[PDB]
Amino acid sequence: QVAPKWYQSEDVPAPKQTRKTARPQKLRASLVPGTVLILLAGRFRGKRVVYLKNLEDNTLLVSGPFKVNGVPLRRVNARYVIATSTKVNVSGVDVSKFNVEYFAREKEIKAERVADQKSVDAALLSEIKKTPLLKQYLAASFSLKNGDRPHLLKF
Amino acid sequence: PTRLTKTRKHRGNVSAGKGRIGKHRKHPGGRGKAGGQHHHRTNLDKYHPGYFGKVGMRYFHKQQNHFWRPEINLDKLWTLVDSEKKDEYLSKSSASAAPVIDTLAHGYGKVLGKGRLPEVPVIVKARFVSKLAEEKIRAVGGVVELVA
Amino acid sequence: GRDHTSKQHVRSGHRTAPKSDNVYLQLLVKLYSFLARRTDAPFNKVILKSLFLSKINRPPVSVSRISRALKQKGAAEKTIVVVGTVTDDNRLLEFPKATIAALRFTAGAKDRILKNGGEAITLDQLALRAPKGQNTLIVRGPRNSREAVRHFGFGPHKGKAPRILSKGRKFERARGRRRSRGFKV
RNA sequence: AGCGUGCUACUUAUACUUCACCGUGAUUGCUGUUUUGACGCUUUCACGAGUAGGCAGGCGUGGAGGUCAGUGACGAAGCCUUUGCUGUAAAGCUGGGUCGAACGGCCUCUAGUGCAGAUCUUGGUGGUAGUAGCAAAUAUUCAAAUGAGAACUUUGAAGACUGA
RNA sequence: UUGCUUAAUUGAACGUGGACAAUUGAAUGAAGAGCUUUUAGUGGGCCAUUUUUGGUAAGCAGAACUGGCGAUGCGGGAUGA
RNA sequence: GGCGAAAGACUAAUCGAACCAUCUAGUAGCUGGUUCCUGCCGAAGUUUCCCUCAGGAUAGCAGAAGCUCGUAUCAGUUUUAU
RNA sequence: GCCUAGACCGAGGACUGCGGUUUUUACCUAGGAUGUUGGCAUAAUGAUCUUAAGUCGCCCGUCUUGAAACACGGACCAAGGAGUCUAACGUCUAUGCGAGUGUUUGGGUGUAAAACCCGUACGCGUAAUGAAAGUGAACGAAGGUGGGGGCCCAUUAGGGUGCACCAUCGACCGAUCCUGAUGUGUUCGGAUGGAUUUGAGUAAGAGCAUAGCUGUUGGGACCCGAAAGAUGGUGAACUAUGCCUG
RNA sequence: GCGAGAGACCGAUAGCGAACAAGUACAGUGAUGGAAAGAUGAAAAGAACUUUGAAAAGAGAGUGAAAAAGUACGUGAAAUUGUUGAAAGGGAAGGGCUUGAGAUCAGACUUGGUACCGGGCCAG
Numbered sequence A: 001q002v003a004p005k006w007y008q009s010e011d012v013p014a015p016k017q018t019r020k021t022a023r024p025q026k027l028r029a030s031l032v033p034g035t036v037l038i039l040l041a042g043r044f045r046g047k048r049v050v051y052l053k054n055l056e057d058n059t060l061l062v063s064g065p066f067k068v069n070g071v072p073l074r075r076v077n078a079r080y081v082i083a084t085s086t087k088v089n090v091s092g093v094d095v096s097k098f099n100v101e102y103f104a105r106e107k108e109i110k111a112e113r114v115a116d117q118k119s120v121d122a123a124l125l126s127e128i129k130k131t132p133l134l135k136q137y138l139a140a141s142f143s144l145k146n147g148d149r150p151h152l153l154k155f
Numbered sequence B: 001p002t003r004l005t006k007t008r009k010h011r012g013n014v015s016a017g018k019g020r021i022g023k024h025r026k027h028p029g030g031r032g033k034a035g036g037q038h039h040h041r042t043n044l045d046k047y048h049p050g051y052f053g054k055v056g057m058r059y060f061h062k063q064q065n066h067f068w069r070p071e072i073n074l075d076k077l078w079t080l081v082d083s084e085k086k087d088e089y090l091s092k093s094s095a096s097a098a099p100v101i102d103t104l105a106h107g108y109g110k111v112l113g114k115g116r117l118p119e120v121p122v123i124v125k126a127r128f129v130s131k132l133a134e135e136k137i138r139a140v141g142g143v144v145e146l147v148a
Numbered sequence C: 001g002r003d004h005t006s007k008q009h010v011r012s013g014h015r016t017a018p019k020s021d022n023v024y025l026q027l028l029v030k031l032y033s034f035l036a037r038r039t040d041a042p043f044n045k046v047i048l049k050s051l052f053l054s055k056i057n058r059p060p061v062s063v064s065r066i067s068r069a070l071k072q073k074g075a076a077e078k079t080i081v082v083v084g085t086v087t088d089d090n091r092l093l094e095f096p097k098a099t100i101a102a103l104r105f106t107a108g109a110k111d112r113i114l115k116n117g118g119e120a121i122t123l124d125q126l127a128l129r130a131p132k133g134q135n136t137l138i139v140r141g142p143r144n145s146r147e148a149v150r151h152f153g154f155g156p157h158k159g160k161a162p163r164i165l166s167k168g169r170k171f172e173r174a175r176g177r178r179r180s181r182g183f184k185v
Numbered sequence D: 001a002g003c004g005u006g007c008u009a010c011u012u013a014u015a016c017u018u019c020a021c022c023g024u025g026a027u028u029g030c031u032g033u034u035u036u037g038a039c040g041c042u043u044u045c046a047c048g049a050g051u052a053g054g055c056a057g058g059c060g061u062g063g064a065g066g067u068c069a070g071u072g073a074c075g076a077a078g079c080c081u082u083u084g085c086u087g088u089a090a091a092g093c094u095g096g097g098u099c100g101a102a103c104g105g106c107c108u109c110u111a112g113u114g115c116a117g118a119u120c121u122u123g124g125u126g127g128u129a130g131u132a133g134c135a136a137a138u139a140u141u142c143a144a145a146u147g148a149g150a151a152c153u154u155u156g157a158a159g160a161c162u163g164a
Numbered sequence E: 001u002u003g004c005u006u007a008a009u010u011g012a013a014c015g016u017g018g019a020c021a022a023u024u025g026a027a028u029g030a031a032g033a034g035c036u037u038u039u040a041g042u043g044g045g046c047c048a049u050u051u052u053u054g055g056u057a058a059g060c061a062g063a064a065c066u067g068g069c070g071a072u073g074c075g076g077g078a079u080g081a
Numbered sequence F: 001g002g003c004g005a006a007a008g009a010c011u012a013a014u015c016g017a018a019c020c021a022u023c024u025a026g027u028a029g030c031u032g033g034u035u036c037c038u039g040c041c042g043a044a045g046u047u048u049c050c051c052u053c054a055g056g057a058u059a060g061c062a063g064a065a066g067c068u069c070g071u072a073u074c075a076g077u078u079u080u081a082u
Numbered sequence G: 001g002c003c004u005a006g007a008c009c010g011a012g013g014a015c016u017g018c019g020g021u022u023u024u025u026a027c028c029u030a031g032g033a034u035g036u037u038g039g040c041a042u043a044a045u046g047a048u049c050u051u052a053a054g055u056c057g058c059c060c061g062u063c064u065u066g067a068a069a070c071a072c073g074g075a076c077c078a079a080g081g082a083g084u085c086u087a088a089c090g091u092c093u094a095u096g097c098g099a100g101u102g103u104u105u106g107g108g109u110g111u112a113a114a115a116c117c118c119g120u121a122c123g124c125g126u127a128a129u130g131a132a133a134g135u136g137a138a139c140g141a142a143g144g145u146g147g148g149g150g151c152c153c154a155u156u157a158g159g160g161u162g163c164a165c166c167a168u169c170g171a172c173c174g175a176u177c178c179u180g181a182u183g184u185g186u187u188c189g190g191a192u193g194g195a196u197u198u199g200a201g202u203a204a205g206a207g208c209a210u211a212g213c214u215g216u217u218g219g220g221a222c223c224c225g226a227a228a229g230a231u232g233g234u235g236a237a238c239u240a241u242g243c244c245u246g
Numbered sequence H: 001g002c003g004a005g006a007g008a009c010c011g012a013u014a015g016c017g018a019a020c021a022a023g024u025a026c027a028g029u030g031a032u033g034g035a036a037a038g039a040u041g042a043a044a045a046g047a048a049c050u051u052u053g054a055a056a057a058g059a060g061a062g063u064g065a066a067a068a069a070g071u072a073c074g075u076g077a078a079a080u081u082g083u084u085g086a087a088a089g090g091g092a093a094g095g096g097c098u099u100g101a102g103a104u105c106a107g108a109c110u111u112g113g114u115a116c117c118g119g120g121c122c123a124g
């Protein structure tokens, strides 16, 4: 066999100075706080939720509301959502304290999370009841029926 | 050595480098110098003109020793002087005391005249000499002495 | 595809290193490759290519040819450079004081150079005392004087020597070389 | 879905364009940092079809000089094997089994040195195939004895034939 | 300069000295130009367009120039040198 | 060589010249075969001579080694003039 | 000029460059991918073997213009199986010495076919040319002219010196043709001067020796293959014919 | 012919034809022609004894380091064949490329470091 030589170094070079200064995401124009969303994947696939806040980790903050749907305040990814044209006025919801650290990993749920869910549900249900049938629409799951063409369908 | 020959590199190739059409055969064209006047005339007339025929006269029982006569030219003649006294001879040689050069004892038959002598008298002993060789020897003050 | 205007993958056709395995010749090639790379004196590049040459392309240079080169107007003090062997010549009447740089000196050539007060030096000494080849004079021996060259390009009316083993009246002096024997070419 | 003619899009070659990798040829630079490979390292560009044939660089085998104070009865060599690894490849290495006495790497030397063929040589073995076939010369049978075993041996009874 | 040439102080051929410079006397290109040695295989060809000879003609026989196949796979012509 | 009432018959399964060993690995312009890998270059069936026509020599086409130099004047091409 | 939907790729590895923005000896999209998050490590992942499916795929070797051929060899497997050695050579290359070179026929010596040592000859080279008798290489700085790398003097340019090599005009030696001095064994000698002639010559040597590949010739000559030809022997137990005895 | 010493030679299809009861066995009237064939184990310790079988043999046992050494004897390849397991199979089979399925193999929780740090692989 061929024996290793002196000039064969194990030294690991440092990498060159990368020039990839990242710059902020530009979401779709259709994603506006208060837009009703359809979840396309995950545990809650098919659920219709309310879009609350854009978080700094690129994810969307949504709520069911948890009372109407059973889906709580949680993050979803914009690419796994269909943004409809139905809107809820969310100037009256306080979402000033939901951020990436709020979903930092620690069943049993913290009393913080349950209290926040009650608080956000209260304002949302105040606002959702103003549109007839909106609560029942949010309670119902989305599905594709026979003859339904998503390229032709408006959401 | 056999390991460096092209026989080793031809292993696995059908014709061993000799061609599929031509097919290395025994003696196409004949053996030796066959056909020198017929189908090998185009070689012999090009690369060996003069090959066929007779020129000159025969010499029965030629003895090459009769013709022994090695030649030495004048430009080489001083090599025969002893190497340890050559420098002295070049300076001190005169008409009354000149170096003697016995060319025959050094194994030469004739002194030829190519080249130039030192401008120093010499005494040259030879069996034969060319006309110009002697003339150049006399011009530096020397002489040719015939020996047998 | 490509419509090629020249043959592809052709080697340069010039020798880039000595075929020799003499380690000291390799040391000289190393020195003069450095010199030709870092100095841009044309002399060093010429010397580098000369170190690659084969034996027949480095004919011996006699001391008489060196003396004729030293007799050139203005050249009595130049350093004579020979990439090859310097040989003695017993036809020479006198030899001057001179500095000759060569690969090899025969014993007679060296004795004659030293006896007349000259200097017989190698090529590394030359590099040390003339790194750009200042005041040098390169001398080359006669390439076409080789006995093999006599037989090159032999043919009708060419005047070259035949390839022949024995010499005499019975050896290729008849038909083809004489009008009394047919024709002469 | 025919014939003449015009149009719009579309389909896909080892071809073209950009990029990766291999090689070849050229090319940039490399000694107060030349650093034990300068036959080395390094920058850049272009190119790659091939019978006959030429050349180069490698792989493999028997034996020889040198070296590894190399492997080995606590298992050498050989042989079998979806145990794998390396190399474009010639091939090299390794796990498991079998086995029983020698063998290998490296630097070189050397040759009776590499097979698919030659109606090749010697030896071995198939399919064919349980197949062709074991059909001329009139013809056999019953019982007993012997024997592990009897169409086929021996004895008796008989039926036949050769027909001097 | 000369031994050639002219009636010649005329010429012929080769020159000394002087001058004319990057438009050094068209375009485009140029993996550079020149030179040498040495040796392999081959020396049955065949096809296509065009020109063309003999022949009723031939997938016949014989020439010219070029491109090919032979030596060559690949996409198309179902298949095909 | 024999022998043949003759067929070129017979002469030990051998006869238009037996068998055996040797010369003898007789010669063959003819048929067959010609043993590992990769890389780079890459043909010819044409010229002349040959009792030459299934073969050679010769030139051409091909490879290899280079060498002298470094843009010198070259080109399966155009233009202009002839 | 602006907005907008997809796909493939991420070679390189401190810095060095060109630009830009300037709010800055700073920052950038400007000399080639980074940031972030989830899952998994009893595995999502990758390779091989077997098999299915889709698509393509004639039997190799050979001679040949043309082979899958209704052309030839090949039922199968192992082991063996074909450019070799030698004499003499061409080119090229490496090495030693170099106007020389080659110890090895032989002798000396020996730790005994080795290694070590020695020299006279000899071979080849150093001179050619002519059939031969024979003769035998500098007018000159070993010449003139045009190129020519390198070197020298300058200061792009320019000036000089210019080895190797090349083109060209000469000179020298031998052969051939002419001329024909002083002289004479009066038939020899050959001074001197000429000539679109000729040589495998000269003109500051390049060779000798060992080794290697390739190429050549003679050898069994890459391997196997005739029909034949020759020399010396053995057969009439078959059969042909005669004879002898049944 | 007789006596010796050697080798970059061959290693049982090689080397003389013959490594062996080889110029043997065998063929041909004759002259002549002319093979194949080496190796159990250190030692026969070459398997006593029981049992099934007419016997050859088998099955136990025994010797041996080994019977995966039993005079069919060192190792014991291939062609070819039996059995066992797995798989495929409408007028051949075999091959390339690709993926699936089944089997096999491999790898980072690293030579990990000291509950934390940090890393590996597959992905958004």
Ligand SMILES: CN[C@@H]1[C@@H](O)[C@@H](O[C@@H]2[C@@H](O)[C@H](O[C@H]3O[C@H]([C@@H](C)O)[C@@H](O)[C@H](O)[C@H]3N)[C@@H](N)C[C@H]2N)OC[C@]1(C)O
Pocket (backbone or CB within 6 Å): E049, E050
């Ligand atoms: C005017 N002179 C023409 C001359 O130019 C030439 O014409 C060719 C003609 O013959 C070619 O045509 C040729 O080749 C094609 C095809 C194989 O290319 C064939 O289909 C056609 O039958 C054949 N005649 C045509 N394609 C181009 C013209 N210049 O040859 C014919 C000709 C009459 O001499």
Ligand SMILES: CN[C@@H]1[C@@H](O)[C@@H](O[C@@H]2[C@@H](O)[C@H](O[C@H]3O[C@H]([C@@H](C)O)[C@@H](O)[C@H](O)[C@H]3N)[C@@H](N)C[C@H]2N)OC[C@]1(C)O
Pocket (backbone or CB within 6 Å): G135, G190
């Ligand atoms: C200069 N030109 C000369 C031309 O003159 C000639 O020279 C001759 C020469 O050949 C003669 O010489 C000749 O004849 C004599 C014989 C007569 O003895 C011979 O010995 C000699 O070998 C032979 N060459 C010589 N005797 C006179 C010169 N002029 O030789 C040929 C030449 C070289 O062209």
Ligand SMILES: CN[C@@H]1[C@@H](O)[C@@H](O[C@@H]2[C@@H](O)[C@H](O[C@H]3O[C@H]([C@@H](C)O)[C@@H](O)[C@H](O)[C@H]3N)[C@@H](N)C[C@H]2N)OC[C@]1(C)O
Pocket (backbone or CB within 6 Å): G195
């Ligand atoms: C006798 N007349 C001569 C005429 O013969 C010629 O001389 C030749 C000369 O040219 C030859 O020389 C020729 O050939 C030699 C070659 C043999 O090596 C060359 O070296 C040389 O360069 C070449 N010129 C020379 N060998 C013989 C003279 N008589 O030169 C002209 C002349 C003076 O008229």
Ligand SMILES: CN[C@@H]1[C@@H](O)[C@@H](O[C@@H]2[C@@H](O)[C@H](O[C@H]3O[C@H]([C@@H](C)O)[C@@H](O)[C@H](O)[C@H]3N)[C@@H](N)C[C@H]2N)OC[C@]1(C)O
Pocket (backbone or CB within 6 Å): G142, G203
């Ligand atoms: C420097 N002096 C030179 C001297 O060296 C010698 O030069 C020769 C030269 O004459 C030769 O060249 C000669 O010979 C060749 C030959 C092939 O016949 C001829 O072709 C050529 O014309 C002729 N000049 C050349 N081959 C070598 C130089 N050393 O002779 C000429 C000279 C001028 O005296």
Ligand SMILES: CN[C@@H]1[C@@H](O)[C@@H](O[C@@H]2[C@@H](O)[C@H](O[C@H]3O[C@H]([C@@H](C)O)[C@@H](O)[C@H](O)[C@H]3N)[C@@H](N)C[C@H]2N)OC[C@]1(C)O
Pocket (backbone or CB within 6 Å): H012, H037, H038, H039
């Ligand atoms: C009793 N029968 C005998 C028998 O002794 C036979 O011996 C072979 C013998 O030679 C073999 O042995 C063999 O060993 C090696 C290797 C190939 O094994 C061979 O190279 C060697 O020639 C041979 N000795 C052996 N393995 C089996 C016995 N039948 O020899 C011939 C024969 C008549 O068959």
